[PDB]
Amino acid sequence: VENPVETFRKLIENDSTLYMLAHSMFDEVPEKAPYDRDPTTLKKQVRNYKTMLYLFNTLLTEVPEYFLRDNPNVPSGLIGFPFNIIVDWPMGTPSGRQFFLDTRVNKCLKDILNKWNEFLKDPTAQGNGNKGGNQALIDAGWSSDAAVEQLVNKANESTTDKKKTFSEIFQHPANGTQENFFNYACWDNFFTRRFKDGVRPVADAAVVNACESFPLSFDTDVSRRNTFWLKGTPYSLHDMLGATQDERVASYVDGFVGGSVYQAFLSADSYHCWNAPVTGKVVYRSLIDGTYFAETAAAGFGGSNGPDPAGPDVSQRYITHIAARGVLIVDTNVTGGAKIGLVGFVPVGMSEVSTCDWFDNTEEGKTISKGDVIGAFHSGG
Amino acid sequence: XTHCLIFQRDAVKKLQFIPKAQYPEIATTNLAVNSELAKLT
Numbered sequence: 001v002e003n004p005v006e007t008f009r010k011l012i013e014n015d016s017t018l019y020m021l022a023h024s025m026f027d028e029v030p031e032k033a034p035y036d037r038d039p040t041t042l043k044k045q046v047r048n049y050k051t052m053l054y055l056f057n058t059l060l061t062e063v064p065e066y067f068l069r070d071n072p073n074v075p076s077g078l079i080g081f082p083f084n085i086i087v088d089w090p091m092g093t094p095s096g097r098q099f100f101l102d103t104r105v106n107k108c109l110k111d112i113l114n115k116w117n118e119f120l121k122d123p124t125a126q127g128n129g130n131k132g133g134n135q136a137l138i139d140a141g142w143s144s145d146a147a148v149e150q151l152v153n154k155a156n157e158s159t160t161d162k163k164k165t166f167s168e169i170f171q172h173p174a175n176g177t178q179e180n181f182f183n184y185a186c187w188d189n190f191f192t193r194r195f196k197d198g199v200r201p202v203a204d205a206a207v208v209n210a211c212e213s214f215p216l217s218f219d220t221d222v223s224r225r226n227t228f229w230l231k232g233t234p235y236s237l238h239d240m241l242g243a244t245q246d247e248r249v250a251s252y253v254d255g256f257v258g259g260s261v262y263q264a265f266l267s268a269d270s271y272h273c274w275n276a277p278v279t280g281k282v283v284y285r286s287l288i289d290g291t292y293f294a295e296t297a298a299a300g301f302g303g304s305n306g307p308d309p310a311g312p313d314v315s316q317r318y319i320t321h322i323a324a325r326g327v328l329i330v331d332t333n334v335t336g337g338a339k340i341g342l343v344g345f346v347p348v349g350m351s352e353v354s355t356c357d358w359f360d361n362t363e364e365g366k367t368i369s370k371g372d373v374i375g376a377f378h379s380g381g
Numbered sequence: 382x383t384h385c386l387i388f389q390r391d392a393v394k395k396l397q398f399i400p401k402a403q404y405p406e407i408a409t410t411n412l413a414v415n416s417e418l419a420k421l422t
């Protein structure tokens with residue numbers, strides 16, 4: 001069993017083209033400020049792939065740091081994302097764009113980030129006592145007033161029924177307090193925490209919000225396939241839903257032609273589980289392998305909206321077509337359903353929050369009820 | 382993280398989406414999970 005960072009090292013060094021790209025994607029980052037530092041401004045920018053690999057290996061046993069405790073005013077878009085911080089500027093280069101589209105690179109990143117995820121769900125933090133996972137969160141700043149207030153404020157902004165304290169909003173283990181970071185056993189349990197009963201009541205409407213999320217796009221009359229790479233990123237159902245590689249979904253692509261696509265963004269300080277947007281019977285479910293750190297040319301250096309200091313934020317429409325993601329298609333033309341035909345739910349990874357976790361209640365042939373928790377994002381690949 | 386919800390053409394004819402979702406530039410906060418996104422008309 002090989003260190004996945006070491007497998008990645010060998011991929012880079014044993015392929016002449018990837019070896020080239022792994023240098024050029026750093027050479028193409030400008031030397032001048034602000035690019036001498038990563039987007040947080042707190043550390044020097046990494047300039048070679050060996051330092052990158054060293055840091056990736058070190059990160060395999062680290063939880064993300066809440067760096068806003070001691071540095072409240074620096075850019076905060078990459079809170080939660082230590083890998084993203086390292087490669088953010090290289091992602092915006094022509095050679096970096098090519099690198100992070102390579103399927104072998106992305107298999108290696110998948111294995112690295114999945115090894116990370118093993119640590120993030122480890123309540124011992126890899127052999128540091130039964131409370132190691134919890135202690136690592138406290139050490140990383142997450143029990144600070146700044147972090148807890150941020151989490152409470154973000155939950156409160158979407159509702160009129162605002163709560164004073166974290167424990168009134170989210171479920172956490174017994175005897176949890178701010179001082180012991182609510183006794184969360186590990187990052188993964190904190191990350192996928194559930195709302196307390198009655199804090200997110202299920203509305204009477206036929207369609208409810210599937211994620212605690214910030215509206216991004218609403219597109220009507222979408223095409224079967226489209227030039228998703230052109231400016232404005234028109235949605236391309238065929239690519240998004242994975243009909244490229246699974247003929248079984250192609251009939252659903254056809255049935256969504258002329259339909260509407262709604263997209264919304266989940267921040268790092270938001271609830272990360274998925275709830276059933278409608279009641280109905282699951283007719284299709286898939287997971288689709290893809291990219292992690294792929295963003296548009298417009299989001300890169302010299303781009304009309306780049307370089308993105310928190311890529312792939314400004315590329316969210318684009319990555320629905322290529323990022324690690326999942327597909328769920330629900331038939332509402334059933335008893336107790338709203339009779340609004342087929343509804344698609346497509347969770348899409350961003351960077352190292354790309355683990356798409358379908359819960360067992362979404363198996364094809366099962367019926368889900370509007371508001372049921374049906375899965376979650378995790379930090380990982 | 383991000384996610385899409387996808388609806389069929391004839392279903393959209395029957396649905397009224399909330400403005401914060403249908404006109405996303407007006408949104409200033411998260412929408413609450415489980416809250417109304419669209420209603421039958």
Ligand SMILES: *NCCCCNC(=N)N
Nearest residue numbers: 310311312350351382383
């Ligand atoms: N959808 C998970 C949060 C993504 C935050 N942005 C980023 N890591 N670039």
